[PDB]
C-alpha cells in the first residue's frame, strides 16, 4: 500500500505555566500519546505562535471548549 496513518510533525515536551489570556487565543490542535511521547494540546495564538498545554489542567478544557 500507501500507509494512511497520520503521523504528527511536532510533539510537545513541556507545557505553559499559567492560563493564557483568552483574547490571544486563535485555534487549537491536540497531540495524541498514541504517537507523541506525551499527550498535549497546542494552542495557536493570533500571531500564529504555538503553545503547548496540559490536557488535564481545567483552563485548557474550558478554552478548547470555548473554541467550538
Amino acid at each position: 500500500q500507501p500507509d494512511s496513518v497520520s503521523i504528527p510533525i511536532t510533539c510537545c515536551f513541556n507545557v505553559i505555566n499559567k492560563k493564557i489570556p483568552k483574547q490571544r487565543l486563535e485555534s487549537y490542535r491536540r497531540t495524541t500519546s498514541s504517537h507523541c511521547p506525551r499527550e498535549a494540546v497546542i494552542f495557536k495564538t493570533k500571531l500564529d505562535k504555538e503553545i503547548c498545554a496540559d490536557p488535564t489542567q481545567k483552563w485548557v478544557q474550558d478554552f478548547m471548549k470555548h473554541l467550538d
Binding site: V5, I7, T10, C11, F13, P37, I51
Partner: protein, 83 residues
Amino acid sequence: DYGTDTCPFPVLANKTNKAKFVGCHQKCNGGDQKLTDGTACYVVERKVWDRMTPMLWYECPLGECKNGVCEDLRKKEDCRKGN
C-alpha cells in the same frame, strides 16, 4: 512570556508510529529550548528534517540527548515524517 520551552518540537516516527524528537535543541520565542538528557532522539540536522518528503521511509540514525546534543548511539532504524 509564553516560556522559552513550550514550543512544539519536530519529530519523526518509526514502524511503531511512536514519535521521537529530531535533535535536542531549538529556538522557542527567541530562547533556547533544550530537551532533557537521556531523551531518545534522531541524530538529524534540522534543515534536513525540513526538506524531507512526508511518509517516505528514511534510514534514520538514533541517539540520546546530552547537554542539548543528540549523541549518536551508532544504530539506525527506518523513520518517516508526518504530512
